[PDB]
Design an enzyme around this catalytic site. Structure first.
Site, PDB file in Angstrom:
ATOM      1  N   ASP E  39       0.844  -1.226   0.000  1.00 14.46           N
ATOM      2  CA  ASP E  39       0.000   0.000   0.000  1.00 14.46           C
ATOM      3  C   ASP E  39       0.865   1.258   0.000  1.00 14.46           C
ATOM      4  O   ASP E  39       1.821   1.330  -0.803  1.00 14.46           O
ATOM      5  CB  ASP E  39      -0.881   0.064   1.230  1.00 14.46           C
ATOM      6  N   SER E  40       0.537   2.214   0.872  1.00 12.21           N
ATOM      7  CA  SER E  40       1.343   3.453   0.990  1.00 12.21           C
ATOM      8  C   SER E  40       2.185   3.385   2.267  1.00 12.21           C
ATOM      9  O   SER E  40       3.341   3.827   2.238  1.00 12.21           O
ATOM     10  CB  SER E  40       0.425   4.650   0.979  1.00 12.21           C
TER      11      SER E  40
END
Ligand code: DGD
Ligand code: DGD
Ligand code: LMG
Ligand code: LMG
Ligand code: LMG
Ligand code: SQD
Ligand code: SQD
Ligand code: Y01
Lengths: 390, 189, 75, 169, 85
Positions: E39-40
């Site tokens: 993800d981030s």
């Protein structure tokens, strides 16, 4: 020049209405306030020891007599005896402070510049005043005398458009700013407004307002005041308690500040004196000689305050010594008589400064009472609102 | 423009000699210790380009010392006693054991700091949501790295938290923290 | 006075013979230690309620034999 | 406050020391507390200490208004010295007006003003106090042993009392 | 100065693989970071692991614009390139 040329009868009835001893004649533009210095004899710039030592030691003796009288009966004195001693000491210190303001402009004893600078610093210290900031502000005053938006180190008057701007900016006359302005310019505390000037020295205690090659001199200038209020002010309290402080220091302080404020306020404020912005009709000699006032004193007060009311004899001649300020005036009336303005000590003059001459309007170019002005600009708010309902 | 002769569009800010020796060549800006003899990057360069290791050694140890590390003061002549105890009065074996313990402790401290940084990035991504109100759940890798390398003063992170919580703008960051100079007083320290 | 002075690193006061006599009589002295190469110097510590609080005085006791009963009487 | 066009307005070089409004704030607090406590009790020490501290810290916060010059450095020096002396007097001798009858309760501990003064000294040291660095004790004949210059070394030896020793160097 | 991009690329691929749990031949030299199971708040953990593996400090702006393992390897190679000077 506001109520300029018209028959002298109405200017005389105006002078009697305002308590003024005279109203000036017409002055034409294009002159230099240093011109009329060519008239004075070459002996009015003379130096002598006796007059100066008298000018420094007479108010000293006044203050010393007052202190001795007080310390004789330190706190058992009644209220009005205390007021008498406070007034006497404050007057003696106003005299010593004028000697200070003399040596600040380097015209007291030019023979010893170091000794005279040290004397000015020492005598300015007890009032919490820095010599070089005072000198800068006074030259900045002389340069912009009676100029609008430019002379803030004098009695800059409060104008009309700015008060309407603040009226809108506060959303009515009920904010803190408007109430403060009213209470300060309506009650006799105005006669002490010089206190605020004392808080506008110490320009934020910020050397970024000055020229770098002067830093070491400006800081030392802020040293003698601070050191005083760091060393002596404690000692007094330590040896006198709170009351013993409100007696031997604070009251002569308020006396000296009264004297200062009233001297300036009556020297450069009057209804027959307009406040033009330069470009819109300003001139040096005009706003110097025509827009000024000289006040009269009893010769006891004149030997005490050390000619503290003769501000023009040393505005035409910035190098004129102090024991010659009356004599020089003797010459000036001989030449510029019709253009001079004069006034005397009167509680009526002060009462008109307090109640009548409160707000300066540039349309009529004169001073008006504050409650009438405030109701009328409320009426102009009604007008602009009437133009705004649609 | 106080400058009489020359005034470029950028004002001149004086430069002064440094006051402390730079980080070695081997250490990371972080809290974890180094490889303790040879850095890992030394393996990806030509043999004829890794003279900078021993050159940096010669520099920090003998050749460029900033004249602010050779000041004789009343504080340094007692720190001398402390350091000389540590270097001449202790046997190297106890020194070695203390060295191992300190390395282990610092590794654990670094792990804790990394966990804390990750939690901080979550919290800030969460608060920027309330701030901008809308879609951005994002943070900035810039700020995560700057937090892991101790490049922000506390005032900077406070201003950044306020700016996030009020306007979002997760890409507007405080300028940078500048290096702390070496404190000097007088003959005292 | 105690209101016109600076606090400076409290030191041992000095009592001659009778201020200490009156103090041990009034029941305010709390402890005493003997010292000196000649067994006649005393360091006397008073107790809280005494005028001035707990402090330390130094007294030289001229050889008088009825001191012992005097001290032991007042605790 | 807040300025939505640039929120980081404080972290910008204005020309003065960062710990500048703290110096003036602390001088005001010191003078106010001095006057308050020394009138509300009757002791002459707290007002003298408070006004002296206030005056010196005000002068320091004035000279700290141009951090590039030399006064901008002597200012931080004076400020650190004064706050350090405050911390010293508090934690080692205590305050005269805080005397009691007991002897373990009237012992000097660290109270609020000492903590503020200590925070000030730490904040000064962590910002910039690196100025006037050429004032230290003079160099020995032990610092010029391996110096590459003979006139300098002879000067140092001569000063420290070794002008006659032979320089076989 | 003269850096061997081959070794750097190999080891960056190995680190990414070992970090995500994907086999090494699946992470292509141009495979982006969201498509590979991240993800981030996990592209920053692999950044930290990269710094820890190479013992260098990543520039932050250049770390805001990392999208392909190739650009990561190139940033790391540029960092190691300018080390002695
Ligand atoms: C229990 C374990 C200790 C056993 C031992 O032999 O206890 C005594 C040990 C001394 O151990 C000595 O430790 C020495 C360590 O030397 C090593 O380290 C030395 C530096 O100290 C030298 O460098 C030396 O060359 C290098 O070999 C050697 O091992 C000796 O053989 C061994 O007698 O002291 C200690 O544990 C330290 C005592 C601390 C008491 C406080
Ligand atoms: C402004 C309000 C005055 C005030 O608050 O001022 C009180 C003190 C400052 O007063 C100083 O107080 C000192 C004595 O402090 C001690 O005594 C005080 C009461 O005597 C308090 O107990 C204080 O915590 C304790 O340390 C000396 O009297 C100094 O001369 C006097 O300036 O500030 C403080 O409490 C410290 C302020 C911490 C803010 C950061
Ligand atoms: C004595 C010997 C004297 C010889 C020397 C004579 C020199 C005469 C020149 C001296 C110059 C003094 C100028 C005086 C001056 O400008 O003051 C007059 C100045 C006003 O003047 C103008 O005022 C404007 C409005 O603020 C702007 O500030 C202008 O900048 C300011 O010039 O006084 C003020 O600043 C008053 C406002 C502050 C509010 C007052 C609060 C009072 C506090 C309560 C007082 C305690 C209770 C009583
Ligand atoms: C905790 C100790 C506080 C001091 C930490 C300073 C760390 C720092 O960098 O601060 C961050 C910034 C300093 O900012 C730094 O300035 C430097 C200039 O030399 C460089 O530009 C650095 O990059 C910049 O980070 O702090 C401030 O701007 C002032 C903060 C005041 C902190 C002191 C508070 C304690 C004072 C209590 C006294 C109250 C009396 C009333
Ligand atoms: C929170 C208050 C602002 C934080 C603060 O310490 O400001 C401190 C900042 C720091 O001040 C600025 O710091 C910069 C950092 O490099 C530069 O050094 C500037 O020279 C310095 O003025 O100053 C202000 O913004 C003054 C406002 C704070 C006044 C608080 C009164 C108490
Ligand atoms: C009596 C003491 C009076 C002191 C008054 C208060 C002083 C306040 C403390 C001074 C600030 C610290 C300065 C500094 O960190 O210097 C760097 C010093 C070494 O001094 C440095 O050490 C260097 C040699 S080396 O580091 O030891 O190898 C050398 O460059 C330099 O000359 C020497 O200064 O590093 C230290 O480890 C100091 C940590 C301990 C200081 C806090 C204890 C408080 C006392
Ligand atoms: C007997 C001796 C007694 C001693 C007497 C001395 C008394 C002095 C006491 C002074 C009181 C100190 C606090 C003053 C605070 C102040 O003026 O802020 C000045 C700052 C601007 O700073 C400024 O801002 C300027 C840039 S600008 O204004 O933002 O454009 C910049 O030039 C400057 O560096 C910066 O400081 O004003 C602000 O914008 C307001 C935000 C400040 C943050 C909170 C402070 C508000 C008070 C909270 C309580
Ligand atoms: C306490 C008394 C009995 C002893 C003498 C104290 C003076 C030396 C103090 C009291 C009031 C102080 C002033 C109060 C307010 C200010 C503004 C302050 O500066 C600012 O607020 C900066 C400008 C701004 O914030 O817009 C610090 C300087 C000054 C003139 C202070 C200078 C020092 C003064 C004159």
């Amino acid at each position: 020049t506001s109520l300029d040329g018209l028959p002298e009868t109405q200017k005389y009835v105006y002078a009697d209405e305002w308590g003024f001893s005279r109203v000036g004649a017409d002055f034409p533009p294009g002159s230099h306030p240093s011109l009329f210095s060519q008239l004075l004899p070459q002996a009015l710039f003379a130096f002598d020891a006796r007059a100066a030592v008298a000018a420094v030691a007479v108010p000293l003796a006044a203050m010393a007599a007052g202190y001795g009288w007080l310390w004789y009966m330190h706190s058992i004195a009644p209220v009005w005896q205390q007021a008498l001693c406070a007034a006497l000491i404050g007057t003696g210190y106003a005299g010593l402070f004028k000697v200070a303001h003399e040596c600040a402009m380097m015209r007291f004893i030019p023979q010893m510049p170091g000794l005279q600078a040290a004397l000015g610093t020492l005598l300015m210290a007890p009032a919490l005043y820095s010599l070089p900031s005072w000198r800068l502000h006074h030259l900045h005053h002389l340069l912009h005398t009676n100029m609008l938006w430019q002379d803030v180190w004098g009695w800059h008057p409060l104008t009309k458009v700015e008060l309407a701007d603040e009226m809108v900016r506060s959303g009515g006359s009920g904010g803190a700013a408007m109430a403060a302005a009213r209470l300060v310019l309506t009650t006799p505390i105005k006669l002490f407004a010089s206190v605020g000037h004392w808080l506008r020295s110490w320009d934020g205690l910020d050397l970024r307002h000055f020229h770098p090659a002067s830093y070491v001199e400006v800081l030392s200038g802020w040293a003698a005041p601070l050191a005083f209020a760091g060393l002596v002010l404690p000692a007094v309290v330590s040896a006198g308690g709170l009351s013993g402080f409100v007696s031997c220091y604070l009251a002569p302080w308020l006396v000296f500040h009264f004297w200062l404020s009233v001297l300036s306020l009556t020297a450069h404020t009057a209804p027959h004196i307009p406040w033009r912005a330069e470009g819109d009709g300003w001139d040096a000699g005009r706003a110097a000689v025509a827009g000024t006032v000289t006040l009269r004193l009893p010769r006891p007060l004149e030997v005490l305050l050390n000619n503290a009311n003769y501000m023009l004899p040393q505005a035409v001649a910035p190098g004129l010594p102090m024991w010659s300020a009356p004599a020089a005036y003797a010459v000036l009336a001989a030449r510029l008589g019709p253009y001079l303005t004069e006034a005397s000590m009167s509680l009526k003059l002060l009462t008109n400064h307090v109640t009548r001459w409160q707000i300066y309007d540039e349309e009529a170019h004169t001073y008006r009472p504050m409650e009438e002005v405030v109701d009328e600009i409320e009426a102009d708010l009604q007008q602009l609102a009437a133009a705004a309902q649609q | 423009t106080s400058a009489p002769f020359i005034s470029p569009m950028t004002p001149y800010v004086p430069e002064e000699e440094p006051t402390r020796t730079p980080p070695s060549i081997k250490d990371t800006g972080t809290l974890r210790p180094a490889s303790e003899w040879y850095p890992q990057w030394m393996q990806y360069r030509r043999r004829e380009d890794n003279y900078v290791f021993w050159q940096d050694k010669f520099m920090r140890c003998s050749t460029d010392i900033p004249w602010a590390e050779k000041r004789w003061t009343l504080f340094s002549t007692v720190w001398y006693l402390v350091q000389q105890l540590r270097f001449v009065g202790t046997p190297p074996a106890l020194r070695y054991v203390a060295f191992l313990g300190w390395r282990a402790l610092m590794f654990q401290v670094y792990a804790a700091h990394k966990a804390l940084v990750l939690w901080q990035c979550k919290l800030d991504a969460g608060l920027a949501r309330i701030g901008s109100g809308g879609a951005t759940a994002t943070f900035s890798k810039t700020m995560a790295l700057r937090r892991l390398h101790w490049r922000n003063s506390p005032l900077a992170e406070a201003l950044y938290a306020l700016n996030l919580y009020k306007t979002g703008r997760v890409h507007l960051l405080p300028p940078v923290a500048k290096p702390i100079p070496r404190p000097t007083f007088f003959w005292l320290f | 006075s105690v209101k016109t002075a600076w606090r400076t690193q409290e030191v041992l006061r000095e009592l001659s013979y009778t201020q200490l006599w009156a103090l041990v009589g009034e029941g305010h002295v709390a402890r005493v230690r003997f010292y000196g190469p000649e067994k006649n110097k005393v360091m006397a510590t008073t107790r809280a309620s005494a005028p001035g609080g707990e402090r330390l005085c130094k007294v030289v006791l001229p050889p008088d034999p009825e001191l012992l009963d005097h001290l032991v009487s007042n605790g | 406050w807040w300025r939505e066009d640039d929120p980081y307005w404080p972290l910008r070089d204005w020309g003065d020391h960062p710990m500048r409004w703290w110096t003036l704030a602390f001088a005001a607090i010191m003078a106010a507390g001095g006057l308050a406590t020394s009138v509300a009790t009757g002791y002459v020490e707290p007002v003298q200490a408070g006004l002296g501290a206030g005056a010196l810290l005000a002068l320091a916060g004035a000279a700290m208004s141009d951090a590039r010059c030399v006064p901008g450095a002597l200012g931080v020096k004076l400020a650190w010295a004064v706050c350090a002396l405050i911390v010293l007097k508090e934690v080692s001798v205590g305050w005269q007006h805080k005397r009691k009858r007991r002897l373990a309760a009237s012992a000097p501990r660290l109270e609020l003003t000492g903590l503020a003064a200590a925070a000030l000294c730490a904040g000064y040291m962590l910002t910039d106090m690196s100025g006037m660095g050429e004032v230290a004790l003079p160099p020995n004949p032990g610092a010029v042993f391996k110096s590459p210059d003979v006139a300098y070394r002879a000067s140092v030896w001569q000063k420290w009392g070794y002008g006659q020793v032979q320089m076989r160097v | 100065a003269a850096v061997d991009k081959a070794k750097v690329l190999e080891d960056v691929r190995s680190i990414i693989s070992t970090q995500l749990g994907t086999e090494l031949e699946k992470v292509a030299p141009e495979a982006k970071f969201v498509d590979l199971g991240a993800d981030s708040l996990d592209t920053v953990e692999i950044m930290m692991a990269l710094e820890e593996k190479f013992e260098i400090a990543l520039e932050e702006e250049g770390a805001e614009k990392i999208a392909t393992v190739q650009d990561a390897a190139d940033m790391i190679a540029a960092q190691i390139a300018a080390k002695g000077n």
